[PDB]
From a paper:
The seven fragments M-10, M-49, M-76, M-79, M-80, M-92 and M-109 share a common substructure of a sulfonic acid functional group connected to an aromatic ring. The sulfonate groups of these seven fragments bind in the same region of the ECH catalytic site, but the aromatic group is bound in two different ways, such that for M-10, M-49, M-76, M-79 and M-109 it overlaps with the mode of binding of the pantetheine moiety of the substrate, whereas for M-80 and M-92 it points towards the E3 region. For one other fragment (M-10), the electron-density maps also suggested that the fragment was modified in two binding events, being a dimeric form. Of these, the structures of 12 fragments were refined to a resolution of 2.8 Å or better, two fragments to 2.9 Å resolution and two fragments to low resolutions of 3.0 and 3.2 Å, respectively. Therefore, data sets of somewhat lower resolution are also informative and these low-resolution structures were also retained for further analysis.
The Mycobacterium tuberculosis trifunctional enzyme (MtTFE) is an α2β2 tetrameric enzyme in which the α-chain harbors the 2E-enoyl-CoA hydratase (ECH) and 3S-hydroxyacyl-CoA dehydrogenase (HAD) active sites, and the β-chain provides the 3-ketoacyl-CoA thiolase (KAT) active site. Linear, medium-chain and long-chain 2E-enoyl-CoA molecules are the preferred substrates of MtTFE. Mtb is capable of switching its metabolic preference during the latent stage of infection in order to utilize host-derived fatty acids as a source of carbon rather than glucose or glycerol. The Mtb genome encodes an unusually large set of enzymes of the β-oxidation cycle; however, only a single trifunctional enzyme (MtTFE) that catalyzes three of the last four reactions in the β-oxidation cycle is present in Mtb, in contrast to other bacteria such as Escherichia coli, which has two TFEs. Here, 226 fragments were screened in a crystallographic fragment-binding study of MtTFE crystals, resulting in the structures of 16 MtTFE–fragment complexes.
Numbering used by the authors:
A (entry chain B): -14 to -9, 1 to 720
B (entry chain C): 2 to 223, 232 to 403
C (entry chain D): 1 to 224, 232 to 403
């Protein structure tokens, strides 16, 4: 009937001291972390039932954990399998979970959360059910509700209680909408945590001491949350309040402004559950939250985002592409060649990780201006207060700018960021390859030049490897590791471990012109340029890019990548295949590139492109663009433009998997999202195929029909490869 | 079957928003004064034939809540058998009350009906009733809620209306409203508002600025709604914001009454029919741009009555925004001398619930003055709707 | 009076109770959208562009029910943007008034197909949320002699001489006839169960009913600011008001919505729709606003004079069970037979969703006329402020 329960193993340990304080120690024996699994639901149901039974002999409850992490989310393995027909079970599961927490909450006696480590998602939802939260200010301790980042929403009372605690606007912006994780100090600052302790050993004693003092100082209000008292007033007011009702119609429009119209239903569902929940009582609000939760879990976007940002991202971090058996080799001195934006950013993220960096350029003045990129970055970090002056000085002190090739003495890790000329890169490596250590990694930050050709410029080709970064290096989280033919597996592992060391996500790519990121992002740019040549309005092309979910619209990106760079990229791919006796595959976007080069509008670096630029600031599209390409003469559906750019990247990704360029779909999904900004709601350019949804249906079969639908209308380049076909 | 005739059409002066003369007057008192004026003009009227009172009100809360129509029937001492119903179709609530009244008379089940609206925006501001399109995030995200002002600026951008274009129209409305007042056109219809002691409170449209100059309008000044509008209208790069407080409709208080009945009802009461409701129509357009509803509604009511633009002597569109009227004039190729000939809401104001009934009576008088035959009245509506009515002078 | 108005569909939601009701978590906009999607399921090939207006009754158009909830329903349900959408308020008869206006719009010839109905989520937007001049303005409250409906209902029982056992005997019959109707499956194809965004069931029955009601239980209930003095100042010949009305013999506070599809013969024939009933006549009248609830009797006589009919010509009488004495007075005035009056129960058992009531009891009579294979039915409601509305339908 209406129970605390939904074979499994016990997860909670029971302990009632002489004062009547029961200590519920969550300790899942089937893993290293407490997770809202079927074992927890049964274990918490047993403990809560015993709390109701022994209520006459219990004076307080303390919820603690025996793991290094308090409690980190739920069984994502289970929620990703929830089909639309399983919405009833999903609803009953979260209703049972919140029924247990609601009983623990309304127990008539204080309950304190002893947060020892990370309390994330469902874990923070357990602490929020308690009346008092004490956190241990320790390393790596995080608190937050990152449900939205998996296409879900806080369904275990997270949305209902954070709204009751901070109001609609504060709870949405600060905690719910972006799933922000907080350190224990910041968690106490915003109200998520009530007080802090230095070590984990003081937690449980302080929790029982607070219960001892709360019963003595507040006998009436003990074990009663603020929203359960008489005369509770929600901060900021309810939607019926005259103040909130004036600004409330601007919340969904602002959210659509942030999402840029991208089909992400999770933030919208959070704002709906937050507002609709504030209009009714707590229990009814909680049931509304359950229905929106079951709506997302059974939806396809959540399955895409759960696949990418939970399973795929863990499979990468677990060394899925790291060679087996290879051990760890420390990195003592990093030598960066070139002090451009790339080389300076490389030198920053390396020194930020604690490495000693020797930033070499042609001149001491150039190498000094490169270190200034880290100084102006530490300036903003010290201004907004993200780091201390103590460690900001130690960070810059690890960067040693130089112009002498002898200062690469003792370097066991070389990253090159000079301009992309083959003979140039061969000269730069030749004058340092004998100064550095004999086991030094020789890395290149090329974006198109094949690694096997660059490897001939050194004698230790087995240690030559491609280390492709993305600007700005201080913010872009992906590193494309390219494996040449001679690149050993040890060099692959050391660069793999280096990428994780600087706090970035690696993908391993076999050598091929264009690699994976540059090759796939070309199809995205080329589809837009095609559409412009076909006569589509330039504003519609940019809108189609933003509404697809991309961070930057394509024509705007086509100005940062420079059309002269795009021109010689197409000339190089043509010349290479032509020398092999074949017939190059020309793309219709090439005609639009050459037309813009002729008009003297080659991109942002020139100062004029598809947009007009003033004092280095973009200021609207070029008015002569419409007359040049007869804009308005072709008016296809916006969803066709959106699908033309998404499918182009999705089909090119499938080619890279067929050609062995990628070795795992996890590298393709994370590599597309974090490398070239593929929309996160898709779950990646590889997940988009199996997770496609439209009028043709859902799944790989619908993607194929829609690909053939686009192929008939816009060209056979949208024909699905043989692997996708049954 | 039956034919609907307008026997009377009066209205109150429109009191401005800031320091308005009608701010102290309850909206119920505005309607009761117009009811007493109808008794003054026809003391022989057997009010037992008045079968319903249909009032339009956009914010039916507070002073305007609890079926203000029924309150007006009881408070004014009308027979208890005279019904009383409040409706709401946003800006065209006044004209919808008239249309419904005419439709009830045509149905043969109603003999004599009072219709009109009331809106005391200084006491009950717009949006006070709440709403699901705005306050519910699940549906605000779906219907792409955008304020009417942005949809008006979007129209000016798409149609190529400059800042001088919308301001030149705003100057025209100010001049034609002053010309109509100084010409005594509004003498019979504008019923001055008085207190319980008979002392004068307001006898003119306070929102009018007849000393407006083109230079003064150019010195006027125009939360993510622009991005929401451009997400649907993806071919337009940027919205040119041209509308200011001088080229948009004013926020004013007021009320209007229209006595509609069958021929038999008017003959039995000795009433002289002034105009005949020829046809009405309700249509709509995209709710993001919102204010493009009048064009299909006007087109629909013209085909229903078997009439064309050439057969209409006077066009009366509510001047919610200057671009909405210029867009309407551009679409149907309306002559300049036929469009809002006595000024509009830009000069005199826009009392939401009562505007449809105000411009309706404004055309009844102007049809009799010019001795013209037909007039078409239409309004743009929030949510993308549109209402149009064709009257013929009898 | 040219075009004939026909009822093609008449559906409603189950009526969820006020205290811990199943529908308290459902927004009233969602209740209306649910009925729109049901009409789409029953007629998938219906060209919705023919639908020219959506008229919804709503007595408290505030909060969730403000901002033209009909237009919100048109936009949210994805109906054609040219389908209008207007909210009207005529107190308790707003639901029937929307149907009457929809039928009158069809008769005028300027509208072809109209959705009419009402919605009232009283557990979310309680009565009086809109304020009101007759109540909250002292100059008007003093003049109109404002008295709540319940006191006027007690006054009717005092004047006509209905005892506490009289009003409770009717309440028992309403609970019994409503339970018999549900058990017989009379409401099977008309009550559309409410579901959430996941398809999970929320409510599929009128949960305000108490089918185990007894005469003994009703007699134990207690009856429900000087309003008694105000009513007797006008009815000066009455000494003291006998308060006989309790929560058992009065209408219930419930949430719910109803939808009726009304159109011309050309509109239904073009869409392949089968007309279920025809609007014969409507009428609006009223009586004293202090007793308030004597409005149905003149409105019923007026609609019978307009259609050229008498009491004997009507097969089923359906009056909203606002209060038991109101129905007993209406039965006493016109000599209504017992076996013709509220044969499937009424608001005492199933509830009174203010904006949706008129459209609900209308759809009840369209179904009962077909089941009994009868011809005519007369639907009427008492209204606050002393008004009345009646309508006569005929099975086609
Ligand atoms: N000791 C630790 C403990 C946890 C660590 C997690 C990450 S992670 O952010 O990469 N993984 C994620 C990703 C999504 C999550 C969603 C939810 S949910 O509840 O919203 O479903 C809950 C989670 O815990 C999630 C964790 C990184 C670490 O270093 C960690 C270290
Ligand atoms: N014009 C109509 C319409 C409906 C009718 C129904 C019946 S019945 O309910 O006895 O079957 C009898 C009639 O004569 C009817 C005549």
């Amino acid at each position: 009937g209406s129970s605390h329960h939904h074979m499994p193993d016990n997860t909670i340990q029971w302990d009632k001291d002489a004062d009547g304080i029961v200590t519920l120690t969550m300790d899942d024996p089937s893993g290293s972390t407490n997770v809202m699994n079927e074992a927890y639901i049964e274990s918490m149901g047993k403990a809560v039932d015993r709390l109701v039974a022994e209520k006459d002999s219990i004076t307080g409850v303390v919820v603690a954990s025996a793991k290094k992490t308090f409690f980190a989310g739920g069984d994502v393995k289970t929620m990703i399998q929830a089909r639309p027909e399983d919405a009833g079970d999903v609803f009953n599961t979260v209703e049972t979970i919140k029924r247990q927490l609601r009983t623990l909450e309304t127990l008539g006696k204080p309950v304190v959360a002893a947060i020892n480590g990370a309390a994330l998602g469902g874990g923070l939802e357990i602490a929020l059910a308690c009346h008092h939260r004490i956190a241990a200010d320790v390393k790596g301790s995080q608190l937050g509700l990152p449900e939205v980042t998996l296409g879900l929403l806080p369904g275990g009372g997270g949305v209902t209680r954070t709204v009751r605690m901070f109001g609609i606007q504060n709870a949405f912006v600060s905690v719910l909408a972006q799933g922000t994780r907080f350190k224990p100090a910041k968690a106490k600052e915003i109200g998520l945590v009530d007080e802090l302790v230095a070590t984990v050993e003081e937690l449980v004693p302080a929790a029982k001491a607070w219960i001892k003092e709360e019963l003595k100082a507040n006998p009436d209000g003990a074990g009663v949350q603020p929203w359960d008292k008489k005369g509770y007033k929600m901060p900021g007011g309810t939607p019926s309040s005259p103040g909130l009702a004036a600004i409330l119609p601007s919340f969904p429009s602002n959210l659509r402004k942030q999402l840029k119209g991208a089909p992400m239903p999770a933030p919208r569902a959070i704002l709906a559950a937050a507002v609709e929940g504030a209009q009714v009582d707590f229990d009814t609000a909680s049931r509304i939250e359950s229905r929106y939760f079951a709506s997302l879990v059974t939806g396809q976007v959540a399955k895409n985002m759960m696949q990418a940002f939970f399973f795929d991202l863990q499979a990468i971090n677990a060394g899925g592409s790291r060679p087996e058996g290879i051990g760890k080799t420390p990195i003592k001195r990093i030598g960066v060649l070139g002090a451009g934006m790339m080389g300076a950013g490389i030198a920053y993220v390396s020194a930020k990780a604690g490495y000693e960096v020797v930033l070499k350029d042609v001149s001491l003045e150039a190498a000094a201006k490169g270190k200034g990129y880290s100084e102006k970055l530490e300036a903003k970090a010290l201004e907004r207060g993200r780091t201390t002056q103590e460690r900001s000085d130690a960070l810059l002190a690890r960067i040693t700018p130089t112009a002498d090739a002898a200062d690469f003495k003792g370097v066991d890790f070389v990253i090159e960021a000079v301009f992309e000329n083959q003979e140039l890169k061969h000269k730069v490596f030749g004058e340092i390859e004998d100064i550095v250590e004999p086991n030094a990694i020789l890395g290149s930050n090329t974006s198109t030049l094949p690694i096997t050709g660059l490897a001939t410029g050194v004698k230790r080709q087995e240690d030559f490897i491609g280390i492709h970064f993305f600007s700005p290096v201080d913010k872009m989280p992906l590193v494309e590791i390219i494996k040449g033919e001679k690149t050993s597996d040890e060099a692959l592992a050391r660069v793999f471990d280096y990428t994780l060391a600087i706090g970035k996500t690696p993908i391993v790519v076999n050598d091929s012109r264009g690699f994976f990121t540059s090759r796939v992002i070309g199809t995205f740019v080329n589809e837009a340029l095609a559409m412009l040549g076909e006569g589509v309005e330039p504003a519609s092309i940019e809108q189609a890019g933003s509404q697809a979910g991309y961070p930057a619209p394509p024509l705007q990106l086509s100005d940062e990548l420079n059309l002269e760079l795009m021109h010689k990229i197409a000339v190089a791919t043509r010349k290479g295949v032509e020398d092999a006796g074949g017939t190059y595959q020309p793309h219709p976007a090439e005609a639009v590139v050459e037309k813009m080069i002729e008009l003297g509008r080659s991109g942002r670096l020139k100062g004029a492109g598809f947009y007009e630029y003033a004092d280095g600031k973009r200021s609207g599209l070029w008015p002569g663009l419409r007359e040049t390409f007869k804009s308005g003469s072709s008016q296809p559906p916006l969803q066709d433009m959106i699908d033309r750019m998404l499918f182009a990247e999705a089909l090119e990704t499938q080619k890279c998997l067929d050609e062995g360029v990628l070795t795992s779909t996890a590298d393709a999904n994370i590599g597309s999202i974090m490398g070239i900004g593929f929309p996160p709601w898709t779950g990646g350019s590889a997940q988009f195929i199996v997770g496609y949804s439209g009028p043709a249906g859902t799944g790989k079969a619908a993607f194929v029909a829609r690909a053939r639908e686009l192929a008939a209308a816009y060209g056979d380049r949208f024909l699905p490869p043989e692997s996708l076909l049954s | 079957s039956e034919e609907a005739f307008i026997y009377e059409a009066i209205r109150t002066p429109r009191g401005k928003q800031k320091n308005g003369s009608l701010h102290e007057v309850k909206p119920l008192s505005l309607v009761v004064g117009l009811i007493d004026e109808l008794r003054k003009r026809h003391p022989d009227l057997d009010e037992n034939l008045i079968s319903d009172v249909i009032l339009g009100c956009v914010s039916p809360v507070g002073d305007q809540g609890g079926d203000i129509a029924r309150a007006a029937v009881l408070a004014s001492g009308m027979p208890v058998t005279s019904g009383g119903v409040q409706l709401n179709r946003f800006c065209a609530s006044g004209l919808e009350a008239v249309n419904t009244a005419a439709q009830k008379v045509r149905s043969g089940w109603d003999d004599l009906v009072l219709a009109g609206g009331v809106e005391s925006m200084s006491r009950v501001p717009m949006g006070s009733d709440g709403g699901a399109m705005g306050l519910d995030p699940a549906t605000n995200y779906d219907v792409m809620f955008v304020p009417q002002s942005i949809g008006a600026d979007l129209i000016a951008t798409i149609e190529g209306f400059s800042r001088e274009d919308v301001d030149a129209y705003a100057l025209r409305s100010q001049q034609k409203a002053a010309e109509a007042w100084s010409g005594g056109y509004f003498a019979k219809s504008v019923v001055p508002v008085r207190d319980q002691n008979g002392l004068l409170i307001l006898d003119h449209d306070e929102h009018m600025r007849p000393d407006t100059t083109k230079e003064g309008l150019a010195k006027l000044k125009p939360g993510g709604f622009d991005d929401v509008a451009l997400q649907k209208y993806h071919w337009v790069e940027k919205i040119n914001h041209v509308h200011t407080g001088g080229n948009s409709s004013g926020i004013v208080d007021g009320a209007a009454l229209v006595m509609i009945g069958s021929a038999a009802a008017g003959k039995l009461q000795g009433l002289t029919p002034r105009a005949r409701i020829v046809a009405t129509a309700t249509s709509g357009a995209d709710p993001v741009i919102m204010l493009t509803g009048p064009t299909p509604a006007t087109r629909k009511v013209l085909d229903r009555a078997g009439l064309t633009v050439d057969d209409i002597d006077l066009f009366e569109l509510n001047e919610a925004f200057a671009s909405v009227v210029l867009k309407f004039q551009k679409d149907l190729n309306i002559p300049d001398e036929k469009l809002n000939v006595n000024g509009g809401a830009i000069a005199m104001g826009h009392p939401l619930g009562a505007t449809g009934a105000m411009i309706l009576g404004t055309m009844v008088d102007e049809l009799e003055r010019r001795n013209a035959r037909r007039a078409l009245i239409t309004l743009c509506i929030g949510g993308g709707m549109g209402v149009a009515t064709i009257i013929e002078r009898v």
